[PDB]
Every structure is written in C-alpha cells, then in structure tokens.
Amino acid sequence: MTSVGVRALRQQASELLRRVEAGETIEITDRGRPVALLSPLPQ
Amino acid sequence: TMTSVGVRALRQQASELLRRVEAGETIEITDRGRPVALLSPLPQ
C-alpha cells in the first residue's frame, strides 16, 4: 500500500511510520483524493 | 515553529490533524519522542 486512506492511517499508524523510517514516502488519501504525504526527515 | 505530534497522537486525533494539513499546514511526526517524518499537504 503506497497510498492509504484515513481509516488505514489510524489502524496502521505504527507500521506506516516504520515504513517511512525505512525510507518510503506514503500518500494519504481522503475519500479517494490524495491530500497529504508522509516523508522521512533527515534526522 | 511547527506542530510536532507523536504516533499515539496521530492515531488518536487523526481527523483534527488532517483538517489542519488540508488547510495547508505541515506537521512533524515523532516516534517515541524522536523526529522521524513530515506530514505535509499535497496542493489541490
């Protein structure tokens, strides 16, 4: 899942952040429309 | 400065956080206190 909805965000938040921490970016959709991006920080 | 929320808060307050991002805000995400990710809006 490279694009997840709001429901999946809550149910999967820990795992989604693990993936971003491993370098993935993940698109967040809201009623099917892409609205936000989760990207890794340089840290 | 910015808003920083942890994963717990992201889950618990998801609707309020996405409302802010859709209004244009970028938010820092922490994982057990360490900054790990950026939640930023896509332009519409």
Side-chain angles (χ1 to χ4, degrees), chain A residues 2-9 11-32 34-42, chain B residues 1-31 33-43:
Chain A
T2 206
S3 181
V4 304
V6 181
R7 267 145 208 189
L9 181 62
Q11 289 177 352
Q12 301 172 36
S14 292
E15 289 70 26
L16 295 172
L17 269 296
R18 284 171 46 90
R19 292 171 49 186
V20 173
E21 288 159 11
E24 299 192 49
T25 68
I26 298 175
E27 192 165 66
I28 311 306
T29 57
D30 194 346
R31 333 167 207 295
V35 291
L37 196 65
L38 279 169
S39 303
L41 286 176
Chain B
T1 317
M2 213 170 258
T3 305
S4 180
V5 303
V7 180
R8 301 183 180 260
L10 181 63
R11 207 165 31 218
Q12 175 192 301
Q13 295 299 301
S15 65
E16 286 287 329
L17 295 168
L18 268 294
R19 166 185 287 262
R20 288 172 45 178
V21 175
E22 287 163 14
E25 295 184 41
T26 297
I27 299 171
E28 183 170 61
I29 310 305
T30 59
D31 194 345
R34 78 181 183 287
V36 292
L38 199 64
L39 181 64
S40 57
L42 291 173

Coordinates of all heavy atoms in Angstrom, one line a residue, unseen atoms left out:
Chain A
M1 N 0.8 -1.2 0.0 CA 0.0 0.0 0.0 C 0.9 1.3 0.0 O 1.3 1.7 1.0 CB -0.9 0.0 1.2
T2 N 1.1 1.8 -1.2 CA 1.8 3.1 -1.3 C 0.9 4.3 -1.1 O 1.4 5.4 -0.9 CB 2.5 3.2 -2.7 OG1 3.6 4.0 -2.5 CG2 1.6 3.7 -3.7
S3 N -0.4 4.1 -1.2 CA -1.4 5.1 -0.9 C -2.4 4.5 0.1 O -2.9 3.4 -0.1 CB -2.1 5.5 -2.2 OG -3.1 6.5 -1.9
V4 N -2.6 5.2 1.2 CA -3.6 4.7 2.2 C -4.6 5.8 2.5 O -4.3 7.0 2.5 CB -2.9 4.3 3.5 CG1 -1.8 3.2 3.2 CG2 -2.3 5.4 4.3
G5 N -5.8 5.4 2.9 CA -6.8 6.3 3.3 C -6.7 6.6 4.8 O -5.9 6.1 5.5
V6 N -7.7 7.5 5.3 CA -7.7 7.9 6.7 C -7.9 6.7 7.6 O -7.3 6.7 8.7 CB -8.7 9.0 6.9 CG1 -8.7 9.5 8.3 CG2 -8.5 10.2 5.9
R7 N -8.8 5.8 7.2 CA -9.1 4.7 8.1 C -7.8 3.8 8.3 O -7.4 3.5 9.4 CB -10.2 3.8 7.5 CG -11.6 4.1 8.0 CD -12.6 4.0 6.9 NE -13.8 4.8 7.1 CZ -14.9 4.8 6.3 NH1 -15.0 3.9 5.4 NH2 -15.9 5.6 6.6
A8 N -7.1 3.5 7.2 CA -5.9 2.7 7.3 C -4.8 3.5 8.1 O -4.0 2.8 8.7 CB -5.4 2.4 5.9
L9 N -4.8 4.8 8.0 CA -3.8 5.5 8.8 C -3.9 5.3 10.3 O -2.9 4.9 10.9 CB -3.9 7.0 8.5 CG -3.0 8.0 9.2 CD1 -1.5 7.7 8.8 CD2 -3.3 9.4 8.9
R10 N -5.1 5.3 10.8 CA -5.3 5.1 12.2 C -5.0 3.6 12.6 O -4.3 3.3 13.5 CB -6.7 5.4 12.7
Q11 N -5.5 2.7 11.8 CA -5.4 1.3 12.1 C -3.9 0.8 11.9 O -3.6 -0.2 12.4 CB -6.3 0.5 11.2 CG -7.8 0.6 11.5 CD -8.7 -0.1 10.5 OE1 -8.2 -0.7 9.5 NE2 -9.9 -0.2 10.9
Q12 N -3.2 1.5 11.1 CA -1.8 1.1 10.7 C -0.7 2.1 11.0 O 0.4 1.9 10.6 CB -1.7 0.8 9.2 CG -2.7 -0.3 8.7 CD -2.7 -0.4 7.2 OE1 -1.6 -0.3 6.6 NE2 -3.8 -0.7 6.6
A13 N -1.0 3.1 11.9 CA -0.1 4.2 12.0 C 1.3 3.8 12.4 O 2.3 4.3 11.8 CB -0.6 5.2 13.1
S14 N 1.5 2.8 13.3 CA 2.8 2.4 13.7 C 3.6 1.8 12.6 O 4.8 2.1 12.4 CB 2.8 1.4 14.9 OG 2.3 2.0 16.1
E15 N 2.9 1.0 11.8 CA 3.6 0.3 10.7 C 3.9 1.3 9.6 O 4.9 1.1 8.9 CB 2.7 -0.9 10.3 CG 2.7 -2.1 11.2 CD 1.9 -1.8 12.5 OE1 1.0 -0.9 12.6 OE2 2.2 -2.5 13.5
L16 N 3.0 2.2 9.3 CA 3.2 3.2 8.3 C 4.4 4.1 8.6 O 5.3 4.3 7.8 CB 2.0 4.1 8.1 CG 0.8 3.4 7.5 CD1 -0.5 4.3 7.5 CD2 1.1 2.8 6.1
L17 N 4.6 4.5 9.9 CA 5.7 5.2 10.3 C 7.0 4.4 10.2 O 8.1 4.9 9.9 CB 5.6 5.8 11.7 CG 5.0 7.3 11.7 CD1 5.9 8.3 11.0 CD2 3.6 7.3 11.1
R18 N 7.0 3.1 10.6 CA 8.1 2.2 10.3 C 8.5 2.2 8.9 O 9.7 2.3 8.6 CB 7.8 0.8 10.8 CG 7.8 0.6 12.3 CD 7.2 -0.7 12.7 NE 7.7 -1.8 11.9 CZ 8.8 -2.5 12.2 NH1 9.5 -2.2 13.3 NH2 9.3 -3.5 11.4
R19 N 7.6 2.2 8.0 CA 8.0 2.2 6.6 C 8.6 3.5 6.1 O 9.6 3.5 5.4 CB 6.7 1.9 5.7 CG 6.2 0.5 5.9 CD 4.9 0.2 5.2 NE 4.9 0.7 3.8 CZ 3.8 0.7 3.1 NH1 2.6 0.3 3.6 NH2 3.8 1.2 1.8
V20 N 8.1 4.6 6.6 CA 8.7 5.9 6.3 C 10.1 6.0 6.9 O 11.0 6.5 6.3 CB 7.8 7.0 6.8 CG1 8.5 8.4 6.7 CG2 6.5 7.0 6.0
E21 N 10.2 5.5 8.1 CA 11.5 5.5 8.8 C 12.5 4.6 8.0 O 13.7 4.9 8.1 CB 11.4 4.9 10.2 CG 10.7 5.9 11.2 CD 10.1 5.3 12.4 OE1 10.4 4.1 12.6 OE2 9.3 5.9 13.1
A22 N 12.0 3.7 7.2 CA 12.9 2.9 6.3 C 13.1 3.5 5.0 O 13.8 2.9 4.1 CB 12.3 1.4 6.2
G23 N 12.5 4.7 4.7 CA 12.7 5.5 3.6 C 11.6 5.7 2.6 O 11.7 6.4 1.6
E24 N 10.5 5.0 2.9 CA 9.3 5.1 2.0 C 8.6 6.5 2.2 O 8.7 7.0 3.3 CB 8.3 4.0 2.2 CG 8.8 2.6 2.0 CD 7.6 1.7 1.9 OE1 6.6 2.0 1.2 OE2 7.5 0.7 2.7
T25 N 8.0 7.0 1.1 CA 7.0 8.0 1.3 C 5.7 7.4 1.1 O 5.6 6.4 0.3 CB 7.2 9.2 0.3 OG1 7.0 8.8 -1.0 CG2 8.6 9.8 0.5
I26 N 4.6 7.8 1.8 CA 3.3 7.2 1.7 C 2.3 8.4 1.5 O 2.3 9.4 2.2 CB 3.0 6.4 2.9 CG1 4.0 5.3 3.1 CG2 1.6 5.9 2.9 CD1 3.9 4.5 4.3
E27 N 1.5 8.2 0.5 CA 0.4 9.2 0.2 C -0.8 8.8 1.0 O -1.2 7.7 1.2 CB 0.1 9.1 -1.3 CG -0.7 10.2 -1.9 CD -0.6 10.3 -3.4 OE1 -1.1 9.3 -4.1 OE2 0.0 11.2 -3.9
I28 N -1.4 9.9 1.6 CA -2.6 9.8 2.3 C -3.8 10.3 1.5 O -3.7 11.4 0.9 CB -2.6 10.6 3.7 CG1 -1.3 10.3 4.4 CG2 -3.8 10.3 4.5 CD1 -1.0 8.8 4.7
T29 N -4.8 9.5 1.3 CA -6.0 9.9 0.6 C -7.1 10.1 1.5 O -7.2 9.5 2.6 CB -6.4 8.9 -0.5 OG1 -6.6 7.6 0.2 CG2 -5.3 8.7 -1.5
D30 N -8.0 11.1 1.1 CA -9.2 11.4 1.8 C -10.4 11.3 0.9 O -10.5 12.1 -0.1 CB -9.1 12.8 2.4 CG -10.2 13.1 3.5 OD1 -11.2 12.3 3.5 OD2 -10.1 14.1 4.2
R31 N -11.2 10.3 1.1 CA -12.3 10.0 0.1 C -11.8 9.8 -1.3 O -12.3 10.3 -2.2 CB -13.4 11.0 0.2 CG -13.6 11.8 1.5 CD -14.5 13.0 1.3 NE -14.1 14.1 2.3 CZ -14.3 14.0 3.6 NH1 -14.8 12.9 4.2 NH2 -13.9 15.0 4.4
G32 N -10.7 9.1 -1.4 CA -10.1 8.7 -2.7 C -9.2 9.8 -3.2 O -8.4 9.5 -4.1
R33 N -9.2 11.0 -2.7 CA -8.4 12.0 -3.2 C -7.1 12.1 -2.5 O -7.1 12.2 -1.2 CB -9.1 13.4 -3.2
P34 N -5.9 12.1 -3.1 CA -4.7 12.3 -2.4 C -4.6 13.7 -1.8 O -4.8 14.7 -2.4 CB -3.6 12.1 -3.5 CG -4.3 11.4 -4.6 CD -5.7 11.9 -4.6
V35 N -4.3 13.7 -0.5 CA -4.3 15.0 0.3 C -3.1 15.3 1.0 O -2.8 16.5 1.4 CB -5.5 15.1 1.2 CG1 -6.8 15.2 0.5 CG2 -5.5 13.9 2.2
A36 N -2.2 14.3 1.3 CA -1.1 14.5 2.1 C 0.0 13.5 1.8 O -0.3 12.5 1.2 CB -1.3 14.5 3.7
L37 N 1.2 13.8 2.2 CA 2.4 12.9 2.1 C 3.1 12.7 3.4 O 3.3 13.7 4.1 CB 3.3 13.5 1.0 CG 4.4 12.6 0.5 CD1 3.8 11.5 -0.4 CD2 5.2 13.5 -0.4
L38 N 3.4 11.5 3.7 CA 4.3 11.2 4.8 C 5.7 10.9 4.3 O 5.9 10.0 3.4 CB 3.9 10.0 5.6 CG 2.8 10.2 6.7 CD1 2.4 8.7 7.1 CD2 3.3 10.9 7.9
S39 N 6.7 11.7 4.6 CA 8.1 11.6 4.1 C 9.1 11.5 5.2 O 8.8 12.0 6.3 CB 8.4 12.9 3.3 OG 7.5 13.2 2.3
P40 N 10.2 10.9 5.0 CA 11.2 10.8 6.1 C 11.9 12.1 6.3 O 12.2 12.8 5.3 CB 12.1 9.7 5.6 CG 12.0 9.7 4.1 CD 10.6 10.1 3.8
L41 N 12.3 12.4 7.6 CA 13.1 13.5 7.9 C 14.6 13.2 7.9 O 15.0 12.1 8.2 CB 12.7 14.0 9.3 CG 11.4 14.8 9.5 CD1 11.2 15.1 10.9 CD2 11.4 16.1 8.6
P42 N 15.4 14.2 7.6 CA 16.9 13.9 7.5 C 17.5 13.5 8.8 O 18.4 12.6 8.8 CB 17.5 15.3 7.0 CG 16.4 16.3 7.1 CD 15.1 15.6 7.3
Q43 N 17.0 14.0 10.0 CA 17.3 13.4 11.3 C 18.8 13.3 11.5 O 19.5 14.2 11.8 CB 16.6 12.1 11.5
Chain B
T1 N 7.0 28.0 14.3 CA 8.0 26.9 14.6 C 7.6 25.6 13.9 O 8.1 25.4 12.8 CB 8.1 26.6 16.1 OG1 8.2 27.9 16.8 CG2 9.4 25.9 16.4
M2 N 6.7 24.9 14.5 CA 5.9 23.8 13.9 C 5.1 23.1 14.9 O 5.2 23.4 16.1 CB 6.8 22.7 13.1 CG 6.0 22.1 11.8 SD 6.9 21.1 10.6 CE 7.2 22.3 9.3
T3 N 4.2 22.3 14.5 CA 3.5 21.4 15.3 C 4.2 20.0 15.2 O 4.5 19.6 14.1 CB 2.0 21.2 15.0 OG1 1.4 22.5 15.0 CG2 1.3 20.3 16.0
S4 N 4.4 19.4 16.4 CA 5.0 18.1 16.4 C 4.1 17.2 17.2 O 3.6 17.6 18.3 CB 6.4 18.1 17.1 OG 6.9 16.8 17.2
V5 N 3.7 16.1 16.6 CA 2.8 15.1 17.3 C 3.5 13.8 17.2 O 4.2 13.5 16.2 CB 1.4 15.1 16.7 CG1 0.7 16.5 16.8 CG2 1.4 14.5 15.3
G6 N 3.3 12.9 18.2 CA 3.8 11.6 18.1 C 2.8 10.6 17.4 O 1.7 11.0 17.0
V7 N 3.2 9.4 17.2 CA 2.4 8.4 16.6 C 1.1 8.2 17.4 O 0.0 8.0 16.8 CB 3.1 7.1 16.4 CG1 2.2 6.1 15.7 CG2 4.3 7.4 15.5
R8 N 1.2 8.1 18.7 CA 0.0 7.9 19.5 C -1.1 9.0 19.2 O -2.3 8.8 19.1 CB 0.3 8.0 21.0 CG 1.3 6.9 21.5 CD 1.4 7.1 23.0 NE 2.3 6.1 23.6 CZ 2.0 5.0 24.2 NH1 0.7 4.7 24.3 NH2 2.9 4.2 24.7
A9 N -0.6 10.3 19.2 CA -1.5 11.4 19.0 C -2.0 11.4 17.6 O -3.2 11.7 17.3 CB -0.7 12.7 19.3
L10 N -1.1 11.1 16.6 CA -1.6 11.0 15.2 C -2.8 10.1 15.1 O -3.8 10.4 14.4 CB -0.4 10.5 14.3 CG -0.7 10.4 12.8 CD1 -1.1 11.8 12.2 CD2 0.5 9.8 12.1
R11 N -2.7 8.9 15.7 CA -3.8 7.9 15.7 C -5.0 8.5 16.4 O -6.1 8.5 15.8 CB -3.3 6.6 16.4 CG -4.0 5.3 15.9 CD -3.1 4.1 16.4 NE -2.5 4.4 17.6 CZ -1.3 4.1 18.0 NH1 -0.5 3.3 17.2 NH2 -0.8 4.4 19.2
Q12 N -4.8 9.0 17.6 CA -6.0 9.4 18.4 C -6.7 10.6 17.9 O -8.0 10.7 18.0 CB -5.5 9.7 19.8 CG -6.6 10.2 20.8 CD -6.0 10.7 22.0 OE1 -5.3 10.0 22.8 NE2 -6.2 12.0 22.3
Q13 N -6.0 11.5 17.3 CA -6.5 12.8 16.8 C -6.4 13.0 15.3 O -6.3 14.1 14.8 CB -5.7 14.0 17.5 CG -5.9 14.0 19.0 CD -7.3 14.3 19.4 OE1 -8.0 15.3 19.1 NE2 -7.8 13.4 20.3
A14 N -6.5 11.8 14.6 CA -6.2 11.8 13.2 C -7.1 12.8 12.4 O -6.5 13.6 11.6 CB -6.4 10.4 12.6
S15 N -8.4 12.9 12.7 CA -9.2 13.8 11.9 C -8.9 15.2 12.1 O -8.9 16.0 11.1 CB -10.7 13.5 12.3 OG -11.0 13.9 13.6
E16 N -8.5 15.6 13.3 CA -8.2 17.0 13.6 C -6.9 17.3 12.9 O -6.7 18.5 12.4 CB -8.1 17.3 15.1 CG -9.4 17.3 15.8 CD -10.1 18.6 15.4 OE1 -9.4 19.7 15.2 OE2 -11.4 18.7 15.4
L17 N -5.9 16.4 12.9 CA -4.6 16.7 12.3 C -4.7 16.8 10.8 O -4.1 17.7 10.2 CB -3.6 15.6 12.7 CG -3.4 15.6 14.2 CD1 -2.6 14.4 14.7 CD2 -2.6 16.9 14.5
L18 N -5.5 15.9 10.1 CA -5.7 16.0 8.7 C -6.5 17.3 8.3 O -6.2 17.8 7.2 CB -6.4 14.8 8.1 CG -5.5 13.6 7.7 CD1 -4.7 14.1 6.4 CD2 -4.6 13.2 8.7
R19 N -7.4 17.7 9.1 CA -8.1 19.0 8.9 C -7.0 20.1 8.7 O -7.1 21.0 7.9 CB -9.1 19.3 10.0 CG -9.6 20.7 10.1 CD -10.5 20.8 11.4 NE -11.7 20.1 11.1 CZ -12.9 20.7 10.8 NH1 -12.9 22.0 10.7 NH2 -14.0 20.0 10.6
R20 N -6.0 20.1 9.6 CA -5.0 21.1 9.6 C -4.1 21.0 8.4 O -3.8 22.0 7.8 CB -4.2 21.1 10.9 CG -5.0 21.6 12.0 CD -4.3 21.4 13.4 NE -2.9 21.8 13.3 CZ -2.1 21.7 14.3 NH1 -2.5 21.4 15.5 NH2 -0.8 22.1 14.0
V21 N -3.8 19.8 8.0 CA -2.9 19.6 6.9 C -3.6 20.0 5.6 O -3.1 20.7 4.7 CB -2.4 18.1 6.8 CG1 -1.6 17.9 5.5 CG2 -1.6 17.8 8.0
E22 N -4.9 19.6 5.5 CA -5.7 20.1 4.3 C -5.9 21.6 4.3 O -6.2 22.1 3.2 CB -7.0 19.3 4.2 CG -6.8 17.9 3.8 CD -8.0 17.0 4.1 OE1 -9.1 17.5 4.4 OE2 -7.8 15.7 4.1
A23 N -5.8 22.3 5.4 CA -5.8 23.7 5.4 C -4.5 24.3 5.1 O -4.3 25.6 5.0 CB -6.3 24.3 6.7
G24 N -3.5 23.5 4.8 CA -2.2 23.9 4.4 C -1.0 23.7 5.3 O 0.1 24.0 5.0
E25 N -1.3 23.2 6.5 CA -0.2 23.1 7.5 C 0.6 21.9 7.2 O 0.1 20.8 6.8 CB -0.8 23.0 8.9 CG -1.5 24.3 9.3 CD -1.9 24.3 10.7 OE1 -1.2 23.8 11.6 OE2 -3.1 24.8 11.0
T26 N 1.9 22.0 7.5 CA 2.9 20.9 7.6 C 3.1 20.6 9.1 O 3.3 21.5 9.9 CB 4.2 21.2 6.9 OG1 3.9 21.5 5.5 CG2 5.2 20.1 7.0
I27 N 3.2 19.3 9.4 CA 3.3 18.8 10.8 C 4.4 17.8 10.9 O 4.6 16.9 10.0 CB 2.0 18.1 11.2 CG1 0.8 19.2 11.1 CG2 2.1 17.5 12.6 CD1 -0.5 18.5 11.3
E28 N 5.3 17.9 11.9 CA 6.3 17.0 12.2 C 5.8 15.8 13.0 O 5.0 16.0 13.9 CB 7.4 17.7 13.0 CG 8.6 16.8 13.4 CD 9.7 17.7 14.0 OE1 9.5 18.3 15.1 OE2 10.8 17.8 13.4
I29 N 6.2 14.6 12.6 CA 5.8 13.4 13.3 C 7.0 12.9 14.1 O 8.1 12.7 13.5 CB 5.3 12.3 12.4 CG1 4.2 12.8 11.5 CG2 4.7 11.1 13.2 CD1 3.1 13.5 12.2
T30 N 6.8 12.6 15.4 CA 7.8 11.9 16.2 C 7.4 10.5 16.5 O 6.2 10.1 16.5 CB 8.0 12.7 17.5 OG1 6.8 12.7 18.3 CG2 8.6 14.1 17.2
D31 N 8.4 9.6 16.8 CA 8.2 8.2 17.2 C 8.9 8.1 18.5 O 10.2 8.2 18.6 CB 8.8 7.3 16.1 CG 8.3 5.9 16.3 OD1 7.8 5.5 17.4 OD2 8.5 5.1 15.3
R32 N 8.2 7.9 19.6 CA 8.7 7.8 21.0 C 9.7 9.0 21.2 O 10.8 8.9 21.7 CB 9.5 6.5 21.2
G33 N 9.2 10.2 20.8 CA 9.9 11.5 21.0 C 10.9 11.9 20.0 O 11.3 13.1 19.9
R34 N 11.4 11.0 19.1 CA 12.4 11.4 18.1 C 11.7 11.8 16.8 O 10.8 11.1 16.3 CB 13.4 10.3 17.9 CG 13.0 9.2 16.9 CD 14.1 8.1 16.8 NE 13.7 7.1 15.8 CZ 12.8 6.2 16.1 NH1 12.2 6.1 17.3 NH2 12.4 5.3 15.2
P35 N 12.1 13.0 16.2 CA 11.5 13.4 14.9 C 11.9 12.3 13.8 O 13.0 12.0 13.6 CB 12.2 14.7 14.6 CG 12.7 15.2 15.9 CD 13.1 13.9 16.7
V36 N 10.8 11.9 13.1 CA 11.1 10.8 12.1 C 10.4 11.1 10.8 O 10.9 10.6 9.7 CB 10.6 9.4 12.6 CG1 11.4 8.9 13.8 CG2 9.1 9.5 13.0
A37 N 9.4 12.0 10.7 CA 8.7 12.1 9.5 C 8.0 13.5 9.4 O 7.8 14.2 10.4 CB 7.6 11.0 9.3
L38 N 7.7 13.8 8.2 CA 7.0 15.1 7.9 C 5.6 14.7 7.3 O 5.6 13.8 6.4 CB 7.8 15.9 6.9 CG 7.5 17.4 6.8 CD1 7.8 18.0 8.2 CD2 8.4 18.0 5.7
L39 N 4.5 15.3 7.8 CA 3.2 15.2 7.2 C 2.9 16.5 6.5 O 2.7 17.5 7.2 CB 2.2 14.8 8.2 CG 0.7 14.6 7.7 CD1 0.6 13.4 6.7 CD2 -0.2 14.4 8.9
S40 N 2.9 16.5 5.2 CA 2.7 17.8 4.5 C 1.6 17.7 3.5 O 1.3 16.6 3.0 CB 4.0 18.3 3.9 OG 4.6 17.3 3.0
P41 N 1.0 18.8 3.2 CA -0.2 18.7 2.3 C 0.2 18.6 0.8 O 1.2 19.2 0.3 CB -0.9 20.1 2.5 CG 0.2 21.0 2.9 CD 1.2 20.1 3.8
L42 N -0.7 17.9 0.1 CA -0.5 18.0 -1.4 C -1.3 19.2 -1.9 O -2.4 19.4 -1.4 CB -1.0 16.7 -2.0 CG -0.1 15.5 -1.7 CD1 -0.8 14.2 -2.2 CD2 1.3 15.7 -2.2
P43 N -0.8 20.0 -2.8 CA -1.6 21.1 -3.3 C -2.7 20.7 -4.1 O -2.6 19.7 -4.9 CB -0.6 22.0 -4.1 CG 0.6 21.1 -4.3 CD 0.6 20.0 -3.4
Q44 N -3.9 21.3 -3.9 CA -5.1 20.9 -4.6 C -5.6 22.0 -5.6 O -4.8 22.4 -6.4 CB -6.2 20.6 -3.6

